[PDB]
Design an enzyme around this catalytic site. Structure first.
Site, short mmCIF file in Angstrom:
data_model
loop_
_atom_site.label_atom_id
_atom_site.label_comp_id
_atom_site.label_asym_id
_atom_site.label_seq_id
_atom_site.Cartn_x
_atom_site.Cartn_y
_atom_site.Cartn_z
N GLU A 19 -9.02 -6.11 -4.65
CA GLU A 19 -8.60 -4.84 -3.82
C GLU A 19 -9.40 -4.25 -3.23
OE1 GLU A 19 -5.27 -3.85 -3.11
OE2 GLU A 19 -4.05 -5.13 -4.29
N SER A 56 0.81 -1.29 0.01
CA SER A 56 0.01 0.13 0.01
C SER A 56 0.95 1.20 0.04
CB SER A 56 -0.97 -0.03 0.96
OG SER A 56 -2.13 0.55 0.86
N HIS A 73 -7.55 -5.91 -0.48
CA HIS A 73 -6.38 -5.18 -0.18
C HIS A 73 -5.96 -5.26 1.42
CE1 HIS A 73 -3.46 -1.75 -0.70
NE2 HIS A 73 -3.95 -1.07 0.59
#
Length: 565
Positions: free
Chosen positions: A346, A213, A466
């Site tokens: 995600e 990230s 994610h």
């Protein structure tokens, strides 16, 4: 939820006592360029053991006159510095409690290894945490080294300044606050690692940096900047990169707004604004960041008020002298082996947001607000803008009416897949052939989780969101010991094994990883029209990236604007 807050507190307490039971009475001293450090031997729940050094300073505490400035080299010490316990995290809003926590005294890294005096120098893996440049830490309740230390590597977890304290930026050259202090912290940590990893058994000729990230954006920035040229040898970008739209912002005018929110009574000039912010309580500045963005900036979909920025003037420690897209064209890191990847859903990360305001699905009626800003007219009403939005809509709206799942699928592409495509294509023009490998994390389980699932209200939700892969790389306080034959245990072995293999050799394939025998994992070539990746599910399978068709639909918006792609 109040119930999850209670369950979290319970887990915090049980974890504290587990960590006592995992501490041994064996301590050890290691050398650093700044003085001796004392670490402690710890166990894991799998009965592996490792030496743990936490709280190693890589810079002066950035307090007083050093607030908002680039990091300065730490002061050496005589005697032995106690590194048997963690230090505080950078000032931030706690992602669960809703209150400010942390300290300005946060420029530390932690070093872990199963053997301080190994028979051969070891790959060094350096993890840079995510958290949107506003949250995160290197504490072992989130980032436990317990899985990596099964193997003969050195693992290092860094901290860096967050929020306004890490990313304030002022135009006035006289003030020496150009921005990116938190990225400059990362640079100083990487220089410490290069100069000191050998004291812990590490190979300074074989350092790998990885992050997820904002940590992936950070790793990428560390591969782009001249400040780090040659400091490391492989990079892994997990669900992000430095050209993602969320990864940078021009925030030079926002210091005045933050000051005004904190009680400033003066005019908009950088010197008086800075002098006020130098006296403010750090907790006040961090708490007020949620209010800094103006109505116009929110309308323009700016995500965070402070973060990585193109610096307005050059300084000795300057990290980002140009936009990252331009930095790619001359980047030293284009010449090191690179691995990049994303999870298979995600955008599921936005589940709770779509639950809070379901009317967001109405944005899919025209998709005009998702058209890349460099292609859109200011009002987002031009016929060409609406025709571009119609292309986005056809890519993601699968039924008669747009759904929340369609919205989350769109999010996967705008935030992750499309920027990774744009980066690969931009980079193919500015590299001498060094390989890049793609993975796709597609393993779904609720039996081994991490705190991000609580943030997204993801209990009971199927799909690989994610940050779900972090549970297979790091021990955390919500983890539990898994049986050797379990699908979760095998995924830990495979994910850490692939990362270690790549860190060692620059090639992620090894026939020693279970289920990887029949895998032919080739890197992406310049002439490839369809990307291939290793898909990691219950099985390891090379596949054409399933997201390709949608990626190409996004790319088609640039057919008449190729200069901007």
């Amino acid at each position: 939820s109040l119930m999850e807050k209670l369950k979290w507190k319970i887990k915090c307490i049980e974890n504290k006592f587990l960590n006592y039971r995992l501490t041994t009475n064996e301590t050890v001293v290691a050398e650093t360029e700044y003085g001796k450090v004392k670490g402690v031997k710890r166990l894991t729940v799998y009965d592996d053991s490792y030496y743990s050094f936490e709280g190693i300073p890589y810079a002066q505490p950035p307090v007083g006159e050093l607030r908002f400035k680039a990091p300065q080299r730490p002061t050496p010490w005589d005697g032995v510095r106690d590194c048997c316990n963690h230090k505080d995290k950078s000032v931030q809003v706690d992602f669960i409690a809703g209150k400010v926590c942390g300290s300005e005294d946060c420029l530390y890294l932690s070093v872990y290894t199963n053997n301080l005096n190994p028979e051969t120098k070891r790959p060094v893996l350096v993890y840079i945490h995510g958290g949107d440049f506003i949250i995160g830490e290197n504490h072992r309740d989130m980032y436990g080294p317990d899985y990596f230390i099964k193997k003969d590597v050195v693992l290092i977890n860094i901290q860096y300044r967050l929020g306004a304290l890490g990313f304030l930026s002022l135009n006035s050259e006289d003030l020496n606050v150009p921005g990116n202090a938190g990225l400059k912290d990362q640079v100083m940590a990487l220089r410490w690692i290069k100069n000191n990893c050998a004291n812990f058994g590490g190979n300074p000729d074989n350092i790998t940096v990885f992050g997820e990230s904002a940590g992936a954006a950070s790793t990428h920035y560390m591969m782009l900047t001249e400040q780090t040229r040659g400091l490391f040898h492989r990079g892994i970008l997990m669900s992000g990169n430095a050209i993602c739209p969320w990864a940078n912002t021009q925030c030079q005018h926002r210091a005045f707004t933050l000051a005004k929110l904190a009680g400033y009574k003066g005019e908009d000039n950088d010197k008086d604004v800075l002098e006020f912010l130098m006296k403010a309580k750090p907790q006040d500045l961090i708490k007020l960041e949620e209010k800094v963005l103006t109505l116009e900036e929110r309308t323009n979909m700016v995500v965070f008020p402070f973060g990585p920025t193109v610096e307005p003037y050059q300084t000795a420690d300057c990290v980002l002298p140009k936009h990252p897209r331009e930095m790619v064209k001359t980047a030293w890191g284009n010449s090191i082996p690179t691995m990049m990847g994303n999870t298979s859903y995600e955008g599921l990360f936005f589940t709770s947001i779509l639950k809070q305001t379901p009317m967001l699905v109405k944005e899919l009626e025209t998709c005009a607000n998702f058209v890349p800003s460099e292609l859109a007219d200011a009002e987002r009403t031009a016929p060409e803008t609406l025709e571009m939005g119609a292309k986005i809509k056809k890519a993601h709206v699968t039924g008669e009416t747009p759904t929340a799942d369609n919205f989350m699928d769109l999010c996967s592409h705008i935030y992750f897949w499309f920027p990774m495509h744009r980066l690969l294509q931009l980079r193919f023009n500015h590299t001498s052939g060094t390989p890049v490998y793609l993975y796709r994390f597609d393993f779904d389980s609720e039996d081994l989780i991490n705190p991000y699932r609580i943030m997204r209200s993801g209990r009971g939700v199927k799909g690989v969101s994610h940050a779900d892969e972090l549970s297979y790389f790091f021990w955390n306080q919500l983890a539990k010991r898994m049986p050797k034959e379990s699908r979760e245990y095998k995924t830990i072995e495979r994910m850490t094994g692939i990362w270690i293999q790549f860190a060692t050799t620059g090639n992620p394939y090894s026939n020693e990883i279970e289920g990887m025998e029949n895998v032919s994992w080739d890197p992406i070539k310049k002439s490839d029209e369809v990307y291939k990746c290793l898909n990691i599910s219950d099985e390891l399978k090379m596949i054409d990236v399933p997201e390709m068709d949608k990626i190409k639909q996004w790319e088609s918006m640039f057919e008449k604007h190729r200069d901007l792609f």
